[PDB]
């Protein structure tokens, strides 16, 4: 006699993401060597961590600038990988293919002004719960924030913290909801000296614990 088997209903169909392998038909193929080929990356986030890309502000400029020396809200944007200001970044490029994330997102600020121009800036993380963002450094001071001088070192990095009710947040956005909008980031200029035409270039990268979760194919094809 032979082995009895029950060909089971509901099993067997092809699933584009299944964990099995096909049957081979052309054996004994040896490839040209590619040992130590340069620039290899094995995880998208290793790249997203080390290579910050630029934010997009008014008229598509990767920077902000103000002609007045008074306090001003230079820019505000939503803490969403779906944000308009993030739309040209590599981080957002990667994130559109995952349903959820959690973790630190790092902002980088680089001053490009002349030796004779000085400024003092502030960056704040405004969590959800307030109707609109603070329009002044005074009101925003009560939030998690950092202030800095322009000097010998042109770059300043700040971590936007992951603070939410759920353990993960959606990468996409839909309408003002708790799972898809995690507050705002506000960048202010406290004041400046002779920096009317000088700019602050802003870029973003992934933090030490930034994480993307569930693979998706949502682009219109």
């Amino acid at each position: 006699g032979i082995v009895p088997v029950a060909c089971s209903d509901g099993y067997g169909g092809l699933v584009t993401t299944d964990p099995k392998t096909a049957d081979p038909v052309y054996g004994m193929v040896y490839n040209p060597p590619r040992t130590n080929y340069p620039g290899r990356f094995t995880n998208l986030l290793d790249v997203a961590e080390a290579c910050p890309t630029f934010l997009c502000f008014d008229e598509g400029k990767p920077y902000v600038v103000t002609r007045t020396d008074e306090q001003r809200l230079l820019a505000k944007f939503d803490v969403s990988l779906a944000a308009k200001h993030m739309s040209n970044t590599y981080l957002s490029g990667i994130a559109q293919y995952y349903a959820q994330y959690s973790g630190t997102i790092n902002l980088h600020f680089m001053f490009t002004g002349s030796t004779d121009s000085k400024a003092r800036y502030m960056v704040a993380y405004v969590p959800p719960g307030v109707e609109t963002p603070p329009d002044t450094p005074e009101k925003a001071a009560h939030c998690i924030h950092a202030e800095w001088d322009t000097g010998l070192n042109s770059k300043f990095t700040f971590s936007i913290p992951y603070v939410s009710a759920a353990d993960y947040a959606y990468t996409a956005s839909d309408v003002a909801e708790t799972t898809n909008v995690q507050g705002w980031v506000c960048i202010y200029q406290i004041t400046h000296g002779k920096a009317e035409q000088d700019t602050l270039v802003v870029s973003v990268s992934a933090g030490k614990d930034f994480e993307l979760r569930l693979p998706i194919d949502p682009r219109s094809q």
Partner: protein, 191 residues
């Protein structure tokens, strides 16, 4: 952290700086071999078809990720819905060979044919962009995984096995008009 921005040395500041605490991260999903390891469609088909991963959609999960690299290497799996028998020939074979059974030929068996194919190009790695010519823009003709032929090819799916990517390149999200966010319908229970 404050650093000299011009050097371009990587700077990864942390929540600790202002009293926070870093949180454990699992990144299996973003792993290159894993994320490329899935079936994706090829749209422009003909009864005689040369397998070219650049035929993948530019905004597709695999298509876009593949484009976001300069050089790559991988083995392959294909799923073909065809009428008549399917013949595959390796990179470099004369188109005329697709007519002969001596080459790997799969006899029709519903609903389709799933095969495992080896990387067969003469180069150590392939490219998604090539600045120059291969003849004495498009990519050189040698950047392919062989060709397949049947009476009619209704569907083709490709799957990258053991993928290796090198030299990353720009990867874009859809552009945003609103100036606040890109909003779209996220799945939610009915009623």
């Amino acid at each position: 952290t404050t650093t000299t921005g011009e050097s371009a040395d990587p700077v990864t500041t942390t929540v600790e700086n202002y009293g926070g605490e870093t949180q454990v991260q699992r990144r299996q999903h973003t792993d290159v071999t894993f994320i490329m390891d899935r079936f994706v469609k090829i749209q422009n088909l003909n009864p005689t078809h040369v397998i070219d991963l650049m035929q993948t959609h530019q905004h597709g999960l695999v298509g876009a990720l593949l484009r976001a690299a300069t050089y790559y290497f991988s083995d392959l799996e294909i799923v073909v819905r065809h009428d008549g028998n399917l013949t595959w020939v390796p990179n470099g074979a004369p188109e005329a060979a697709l007519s002969n059974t001596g080459n790997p030929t799969a006899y029709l068996k519903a609903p389709f044919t799933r095969l495992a194919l080896p990387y067969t190009a003469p180069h150590r790695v392939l490219a998604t962009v090539y600045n120059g010519t291969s003849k004495y823009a498009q990519l050189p003709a040698s950047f392919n995984f062989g060709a397949i032929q049947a009476t009619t090819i209704h569907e083709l799916l490709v799957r990258m096995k053991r993928a290796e990517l090198y030299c990353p390149r720009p990867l874009l999200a859809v552009e945003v008009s609103s100036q606040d966010r890109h909003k779209q319908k996220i799945i939610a229970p009915a009623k």
